[PDB]
Amino acid sequence: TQADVLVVGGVGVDHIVRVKSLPLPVVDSMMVPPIVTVVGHTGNGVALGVHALGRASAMADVIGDDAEGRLIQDAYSAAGIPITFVTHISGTRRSVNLVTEEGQRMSLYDPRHPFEFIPDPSLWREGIERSRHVHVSIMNWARYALRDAVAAGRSTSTDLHDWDGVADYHKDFAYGADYVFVSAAALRDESGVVADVFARGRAQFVVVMAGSEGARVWRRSDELPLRISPISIPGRPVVDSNGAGDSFVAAFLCHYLDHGDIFGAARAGAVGGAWACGTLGTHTSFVDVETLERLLAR
C-alpha cells in the first residue's frame, strides 16, 4: 500500500448527548434523545479529511481490545482507509460530548492510556515507509514516531492544540516537526513562542489557528505573519466551532502536497475549517474536492 498522509495517534470514540441547555438544568436526572456512539477525536479527523479530498490516508494508533476498539476498526474498514494498531489493557480513548440546539459543545475527554506506555515502533515504521507525509498527534508515545518520520526523510506535521508556549510536554513536537499547527487560544505572546520554535526547532513554518479571526502563518526570517481571513460559505453558517482544526489541517496538507504554495494551502485550510464549522455535531462532514476548488476560486 501507499499513502499521501499517515496519521499517528488520536483515534477514539465519542458518545454524544443532546441536552436542553448549557449550563445544565439543576436536576437529579433527565431524559435525553438517543445517545449516539461515533468515531471522533483529533487524529481521526485529519485521516477522514484527507480521504474526503480524494487523497490516500492511513492511521497508526493504540486502541483497546474492546467494543469501542472494534467499532473504530470496522468504521475504518468501511472507508478506504488502512489502519495499523496494537492494543493495550487500558482500552480505547473515549469521550462524552454534551451538545445543545445552539451548538455549544461540552466535551469530557478520557485519554485512557497510561502516560508512560511506549509501543513497539513496528506500529508506525511500515506506515512511515509507505507514506508520503506523516501527521503526528501529541500522544505521549508518538514523540518517537515523529523521530522516525524525520529520520525516514518524510515531511512531518503536528497539531499542538492549546499550548501555552512554555510547557515541556509539547516541545518535542513543537521543535521536531516541519509544519507546526497550534491554537492561539492559550498563547501568551504569540510572536515570542513562534520565534522560540524557530530558534530551537526544525519548523519550516508555523500555522496559528485563531478560529473566529482566522489564521496566521509565520515563516522563517519573516518578522510578520501571512494573515488569512476566515472564510464564509453561503448557506453554511457557523454552528459549531468544535472540530474545525482537524479539517483545517487535512485540507492544508492535501493542497500543500499538491501545489506547494504555503499561502494557498493556508486558504484551503481556512475553507476546510469553515466547512466543518458549518456542520452540525450530529453528522460527520468534510469538504470534498469539487467544493474546495469552487470556494477557493472565490
Ligand X SMILES: Nc1ncnc2c1ncn2[C@@H]1O[C@H](COP(=O)(O)OP(=O)(O)OP(=O)(O)O)[C@@H](O)[C@H]1O
Ligand Y SMILES: C[C@H]1O[C@H](O[C@H]2[C@H](O)[C@@H](O)[C@@H](O[C@H]3[C@H](O)[C@@H](O)[C@@H](O)O[C@@H]3CO)O[C@@H]2CO)[C@H](O)[C@@H](O)[C@@H]1N[C@H]1C=C(CO)[C@@H](O)[C@H](O)[C@H]1O
Interacting residue ranges for a copy of itself, rule: CB under 8 A: 15, 17, 19, 22-24, 26-35, 67, 71, 90-91, 94, 96, 105-112, 162, 242
Which of ligand X, ligand Y, Ca ion, none is residue 1 near (CB under 5 to 8 Å by kind)? none
Q: Does 92 bind Ca ion (CB under 5 A)?
A: no
Q: Does 183 bind Ca ion (CB under 5 A)?
A: yes
CA distance 259 to 248: 16
Q: Does 269 bind Ca ion (CB under 5 A)?
A: no
CA distance 182 to 173: 11
Q: Which is nearer to ligand X, 183 or 284 (CB)?
A: 183
Which of ligand Y, a copy of itself, Ca ion, none is residue 138 near (CB under 5 to 8 Å by kind)? ligand Y
Identity of the amino acid at 150: V
Q: Which is nearer to a copy of itself, 169 or 263 (CB)?
A: 169
Residues 218 and 208 sit within 8 Å (Cβ to Cβ): yes
Helix (H, G, I), strand (E, B) or coil at 131: strand
CA distance 15 to 94: 8
What value, to the nearest 5°, has the Cα angle with vertex 284 and ends 279 and 285? 60
Spatial CA neighbour of 263 closest among 229, 221, 294: 229
Phi and psi for 210 in degrees, rounded to 5?
A: -115, 15
Element (H, E) at 193: helix 190-200
Stretch that binds ligand Y, among 66-74, 108-116, 228-236, 260-268 (CB under 6 A): 108-116
Which of ligand Y, a copy of itself, Ca ion, none is residue 284 near (CB under 5 to 8 Å by kind)? none
Q: Which is nearer to ligand Y, 138 or 194 (CB)?
A: 138
Residue selected from 42, 57, 155, 279 as contacting Ca ion according to rule CB under 5 A: 42
Which of ligand X, ligand Y, a copy of itself, none is residue 274 near (CB under 5 to 8 Å by kind)? ligand X
DSSP state of 28: S
Residues 176 and 150 sit within 8 Å (Cβ to Cβ): yes
Nearest approach, Cβ of 107 to a copy of itself (angstroms)? 4
Ranges within 120-179 binding Ca ion (CB under 5 A) = 137, 159, 161
Q: Does 92 bind ligand Y (CB under 6 A)?
A: no
Q: Does 270 bind ligand X (CB under 6 A)?
A: yes
Residue 180 CB-density burial (10 A; 0-12 exposed, 13-18 middle, 19+ buried): buried
In angstroms, the Cα distances linking 83 to 6, 63, 123 are: 10, 11, 10
User: Strands 215-219, 205-209: parallel, antiparallel or unpaired by DSSP?
Assistant: antiparallel
Q: Please name every residue paired with 217 in a beta bridge, in sequence order, or none if there are none.
A: 207, 226
Q: Does 277 bind ligand X (CB under 6 A)?
A: yes
DSSP state of 111: -
Residues 141 and 12 sit within 8 Å (Cβ to Cβ): no
Q: Does 161 bind ligand Y (CB under 6 A)?
A: yes
Q: Does 281 bind Ca ion (CB under 5 A)?
A: no
Stretch that binds Ca ion, among 4-12, 68-76, 110-118, 165-173 (CB under 5 A): 4-12
Q: Point out which residues bind ligand X (CB under 6 A).
A: 161-162, 183, 209-212, 214-215, 230, 238, 241-246, 248, 270, 273-274, 277
Binding site for ligand Y (CB under 6 A): 29, 31, 40-42, 95, 107, 109, 111, 115, 138-140, 161-162, 167, 169, 242-243, 245-246
